[PDB]
Amino acid sequence: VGACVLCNSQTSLRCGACIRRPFLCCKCCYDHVISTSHKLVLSVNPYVCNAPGCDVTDVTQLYLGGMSYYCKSHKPPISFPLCANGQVFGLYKNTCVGSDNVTDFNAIATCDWTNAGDYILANTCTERLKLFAAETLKATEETFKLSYGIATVREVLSDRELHLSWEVGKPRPPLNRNYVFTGYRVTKNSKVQIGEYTFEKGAVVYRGTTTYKLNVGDYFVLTSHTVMPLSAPTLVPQEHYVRITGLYPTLNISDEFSSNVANYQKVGMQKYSTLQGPPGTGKSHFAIGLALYYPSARIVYTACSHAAVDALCEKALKYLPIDKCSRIIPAVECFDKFKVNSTLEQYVFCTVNALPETTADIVVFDEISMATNYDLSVVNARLRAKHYVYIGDPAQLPAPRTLLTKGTLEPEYFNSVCRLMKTIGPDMFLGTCRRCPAEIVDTVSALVYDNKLKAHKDKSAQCFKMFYKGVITHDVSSAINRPQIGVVREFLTRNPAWRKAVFISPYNSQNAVASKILGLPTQTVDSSQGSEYDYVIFTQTTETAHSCNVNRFNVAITRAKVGILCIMSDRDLYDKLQFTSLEIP
Numbered sequence: 333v334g335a336c337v338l339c340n341s342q343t344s345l346r347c348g349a350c351i352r353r354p355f356l357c358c359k360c361c362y363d364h365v366i367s368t369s370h371k372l373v374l375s376v377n378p379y380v381c382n383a384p385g386c387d388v389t390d391v392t393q394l395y396l397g398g399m400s401y402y403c404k405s406h407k408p409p410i411s412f413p414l415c416a417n418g419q420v421f422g423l424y425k426n427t428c429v430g431s432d433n434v435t436d437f438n439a440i441a442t443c444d445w446t447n448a449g450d451y452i453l454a455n456t457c458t459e460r461l462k463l464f465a466a467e468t469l470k471a472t473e474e475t476f477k478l479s480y481g482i483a484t485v486r487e488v489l490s491d492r493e494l495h496l497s498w499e500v501g502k503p504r505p506p507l508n509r510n511y512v513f514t515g516y517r518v519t520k521n522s523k524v525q526i527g528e529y530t531f532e533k534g535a536v537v538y539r540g541t542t543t544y545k546l547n548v549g550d551y552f553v554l555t556s557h558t559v560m561p562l563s564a565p566t567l568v569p570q571e572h573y574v575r576i577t578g579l580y581p582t583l584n585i586s587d588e589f590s591s592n593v594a595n596y597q598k599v600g601m602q603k604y605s606t607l608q609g610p611p612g613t614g615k616s617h618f619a620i621g622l623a624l625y626y627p628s629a630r631i632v633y634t635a636c637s638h639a640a641v642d643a644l645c646e647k648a649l650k651y652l653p654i655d656k657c658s659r660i661i662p663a664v665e666c667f668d669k670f671k672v673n674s675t676l677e678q679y680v681f682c683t684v685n686a687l688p689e690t691t692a693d694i695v696v697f698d699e700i701s702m703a704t705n706y707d708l709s710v711v712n713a714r715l716r717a718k719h720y721v722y723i724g725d726p727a728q729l730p731a732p733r734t735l736l737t738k739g740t741l742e743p744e745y746f747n748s749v750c751r752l753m754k755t756i757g758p759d760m761f762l763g764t765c766r767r768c769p770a771e772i773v774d775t776v777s778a779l780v781y782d783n784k785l786k787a788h789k790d791k792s793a794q795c796f797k798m799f800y801k802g803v804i805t806h807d808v809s810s811a812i813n814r815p816q817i818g819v820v821r822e823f824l825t826r827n828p829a830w831r832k833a834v835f836i837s838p839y840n841s842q843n844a845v846a847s848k849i850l851g852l853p854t855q856t857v858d859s860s861q862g863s864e865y866d867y868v869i870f871t872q873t874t875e876t877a878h879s880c881n882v883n884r885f886n887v888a889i890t891r892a893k894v895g896i897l898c899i900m901s902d903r904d905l906y907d908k909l910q911f912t913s914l915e916i917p
């Protein structure tokens with residue numbers, strides 16, 4: 333028994349073909365079964381023929397005869413069809429409203445999440461369907477990880493390097509950081525975990541959560557988890573107040589945080605507020621400063637990633653009493669300077685998926701572009717708060733959508749929060765970039781911030797661009813552009829100061845090649861988000877949708893504090909780079 337996800341209508345029916353088994357009301361369950369391939373229907377029992385060795389599960393082909401269910405062939409003389417009168421049979425048949433269109437719920441229930449339009453709908457549908465879609469999508473995502481073949485240690489060529497043997501008749505996952513494995517050792521009558529791991533082409537290079545002397549017969553699977561059902565909305569109902577509510581501002585504030593006092597007041601005058609913080613505009617400074625501006629307030633700092641929460645902890649360590657901080661960790665190495673798992677501490681730092689059920693004066697959800705509607709709902713379910721602050725930048729990178737291949741995901745579709753920021757705009761904006769030379773700020777201001785991002789620094793005159801397509805090679809799941817690495821090799825011989833530079837590309841394989849040939853440290857654009865470096869050398873590698881995504885490019889070039897060399901494939905983004913052009917040697 334439960335609630336019709338389309339009506340709320342009290343019901344005893346869940347669609348059994350739907351991977352999430354949503355409750356559907358006689359009306360909505362019917363309109364669902366007759367307009368899709370979904371025909372299995374679950375109640376207190378499953379609407380299946382209880383005849384001995386009959387394979388009828390279609391509810392349109394079944395009858396209640398006795399207190400048991402039968403097809404045409406097996407039914408008793410006295411029976412009524414389970415599925416008639418524009419309704420499917422079960423409890424609470426008299427209380428049932430239906431819907432004018434069930435189109436959206438069908439699309440969500442039946443889509444394979446490979447098309448952009450699938451994620452668009454999960455984001456523009458009604459709120460109750462945003463939760464359904466969010467569960468359905470995450471469950472699909474975690475089942476797609478089982479489709480992957482087991483990798484097994486066939487030889488241990490060295491340390492940090494392995495030879496893998498791969499399960500037959502199953503695909504192998506891409507070997508980049510976005511796929512995190514879990515090793516296992518071959519025991520008497522079972523298997524025990526041996527840390528999480530990642531891999532990159534060699535043989536294969538492996539960067540594991542722990543060190544070991546791992547040996548042959550050890551194997552690896554992408555660990556998938558149970559997806560719990562969602563209750564809370566992605567956003568609580570907005571409220572605007574006429575005075576700061578449930579928060580007492582400080583009388584004395586430092587000139588370090590004085591620029592955010594207007595914004596901290598806004599935070600107190602609405603139920604939830606959105607802060608767009610471009611690169612190096614001071615998001616974590618903002619988040620910690622709120623604590624000092626409302627000193628007596630209980631604040632739960634949350635984000636999807638351990639890294640994001642840890643970065644909030646690092647900043648907190650610099651400004652807030654340590655004795656008033658706690659880091660929530662469930663029973664990966666993260667921040668270990670606060671007392672661990674003290675829920676009742678004034679300042680709680682904690683990933684979304686580890687949150688305790690608790691209340692608070694403020695909740696700060698950081699790096700909001702990475703969040704999914706699943707994470708949004710979870711926060712609202714675990715944390716009942718006077719005020720919610722969502723800090724991030726919808727011009728930066730979303731969570732990877734492992735299933736998505738057809739279409740690009742626009743920032744207004746990353747989650748309910750980025751939707752608000754891209755349609756009504758953000759409640760608050762950090763409009764001065766402190767990190768980047770002005771040439772990079774001028775470029776991303778035009779490119780993604782509507783000319784509202786200002787440069788703190790001057791021009792470095794150390795921002796260069798080269799238009800060089802070179803030669804693209806493709807391996808199993810990545811791209812390589814050796815001639816673009818060649819151009820950088822040659823650039824470094826003539827400009828050896830740049831040997832302090834980080835190498836960034838949109839592809840892990842390009843990175844692997846560049847590390848051998850250049851020996852710069854390397855990052856994927858995606859791994860670089862939230863880091864800065866004095867000098868960045870960036871090879872676009874290809875002119876794909878991946879390598880031209882304006883959000884990725886934005887993250888790539890705003891990593892630089894002083895200078896950047898962009899070797900570009902795409903004439904479009906090259907022409908948008910407000911950098912010094914260089915000819916090809």
Ligand SMILES: CCS(=O)(=O)Nc1ccccc1F
Pocket residue numbers: 412413414415416417419420421
């Ligand atoms: C009131 C008893 S019955 O009408 O035979 N049962 C039924 C079954 C499916 C839909 C509607 C129904 F009413």
Ligand SMILES: CCS(=O)(=O)Nc1ccccc1F
Pocket residue numbers: 660661662663673674675685686687688689
């Ligand atoms: C919500 C359960 S959890 O995911 O285990 N995270 C947590 C929460 C509070 C104390 C200790 C904890 F570990």
Ligand SMILES: [Zn+2]
Pocket residue numbers: 347348349350364370441
């Ligand atoms: Zn269904």
Ligand SMILES: [Zn+2]
Pocket residue numbers: 336337338339340341356357358359360361429430
């Ligand atoms: Zn219904």
Ligand SMILES: [Zn+2]
Pocket residue numbers: 381383386387388402403404405406
């Ligand atoms: Zn039968």
